Amino acid sequence: DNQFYSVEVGDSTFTVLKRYQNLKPIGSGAQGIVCAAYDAVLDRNVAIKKLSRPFQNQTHAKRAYRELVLMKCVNHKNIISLLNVFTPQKTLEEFQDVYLVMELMDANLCQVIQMELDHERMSYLLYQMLCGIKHLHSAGIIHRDLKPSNIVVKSDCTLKILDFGLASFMMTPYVVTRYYRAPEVILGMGYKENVDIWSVGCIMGEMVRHKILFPGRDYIDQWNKVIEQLGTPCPEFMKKLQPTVRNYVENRPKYAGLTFPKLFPDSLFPADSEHNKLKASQARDLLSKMLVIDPAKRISVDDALQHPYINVWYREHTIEEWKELIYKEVMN
Ligand SMILES: CNC(=O)CN1CCC(Nc2nccc(-c3cnc4ccccn34)n2)CC1
């Protein structure tokens, strides 16, 4: 009979295909609830993400459609793969939810951040993170929103990126993380490939200090935290800032730049051997190359991949038009 079935997993009904059994709520994002399950057909575990009415508004629509196409086409070892996509509805009129099925990962970088790691693993995760971004950039995609919660890993240290970044008002009660956004983004100065290097850098630092590098209630408190530790950017940086934005920045209380050995002492890095001592200086070095405010003077993805610390692994549519676009994308 019916190719599906429904079980209650929280507060939203999950109506999925017979092949997926034993649903277990593993998490929730800002666009969909996620479940772990067993796929009788493939005989393996998978993750299922439900998107409720992804055509309700431009924001959710533009994102679900964007993901539905990219996660479909673009494929890389370091970018979560799509196993299948389906909808329990039978026609465009009835069309309601879209379910994304992907390989089941073990955890978030948030959980990895809450634990000390060796240089072997930290640099490996960092290596894969750069490969993914590399593939993304080559595919003409610049994430611009990389963060610990969007990067997943497994027990064997394999890493993969979840979403594909940005391309705006919502009644959504939950705020979005802004701690890992690059100076360019925070101040809308135009950007380029290396804008994601900043995100990476904020993440590598947090894996060291085990605390969010630049926290803040808004981009105001956010910028201060950046100039407090890295120091006011060089005058040549402001000449690239709009006359209105520059004003605000230049009229801000100047600061001195705390050296990197200070921001990241040795008590955070392992040095019980000559190997870890060296790896510490190399790790701290890369940080000072990524965590640079001025893009022009910030290391690129291909250079960071050459670093000795890493190279050791070498439109405007309506809610009705959107529903249409997304539906057909579902059913090829
Ligand atoms: C033990 N780990 C945790 O505490 C949380 N993790 C997060 C990753 C999850 N596994 C997984 N594998 C593949 C895709 C997604 C996933 C895809 N989108 C989201 C949004 C929120 C949370 C998870 N996801 N999640 C297992 C539980």
From Swiss-Prot:
One GO term (biological process): cellular senescence
Main location: cytoplasm
Modulation of this protein's activity: Activated by threonine and tyrosine phosphorylation by two dual specificity kinases, MAP2K4 and MAP2K7. MAP2K7 phosphorylates MAPK10 on Thr-172 causing a conformational change and a large increase in Vmax. MAP2K4 then phosphorylates Tyr-174 resulting in a further increase in Vmax. Inhibited by dual specificity phosphatases, such as DUSP1. Inhibited by HDAC9.
Phosphothreonine carried by residues: T172
Entry binding sites for ATP: I26, G27, S28, G29, A30, Q31, G32, I33, V34, K49
Positions of modified residues (Phosphotyrosine): Y174
Positions of the catalytic residues: D145
Gene Ontology molecular function: any one: MAP kinase kinase activity
Reactions it catalyzes: L-seryl-[protein] + ATP = O-phospho-L-seryl-[protein] + ADP + H(+); L-threonyl-[protein] + ATP = O-phospho-L-threonyl-[protein] + ADP + H(+)
Listed cofactors: Mg(2+)
Residue ranges annotated for the Protein kinase domain, each copy included: 20-310
UniProt EC number: 2.7.11.24
Tissue-by-tissue expression: Specific to a subset of neurons in the nervous system. Present in the hippocampus and areas, cerebellum, striatum, brain stem, and weakly in the spinal cord. Very weak expression in testis and kidney.
Main enzyme class: transferase
Entry GO CC: cytoplasm; cytosol; mitochondrion; nucleoplasm; nucleus; plasma membrane
Protein modification: Dually phosphorylated on Thr-172 and Tyr-174 by MAP2K4 and MAP2K7, which activates the enzyme. MAP2K7 shows a strong preference for Thr-172 while MAP2K4 phosphorylates Tyr-174 preferentially. Weakly autophosphorylated on threonine and tyrosine residues in vitro. Palmitoylation regulates subcellular location and axonal development.
Compartments, record wording: Cytoplasm; Membrane; Nucleus; Mitochondrion
Domain-related comment: The TXY motif contains the threonine and tyrosine residues whose phosphorylation activates the MAP kinases.
Family membership noted in the UniProt record: Belongs to the protein kinase superfamily. CMGC Ser/Thr protein kinase family. MAP kinase subfamily.
Disease: A chromosomal aberration involving MAPK10 has been found in a single patient with pharmacoresistant epileptic encephalopathy. Translocation t(Y;4)(q11.2;q21) which causes MAPK10 truncation.
Record-given protein name: Mitogen-activated protein kinase 10
The organism's taxonomic lineage, starting at the top: Eukaryota, Metazoa, Chordata, Craniata, Vertebrata
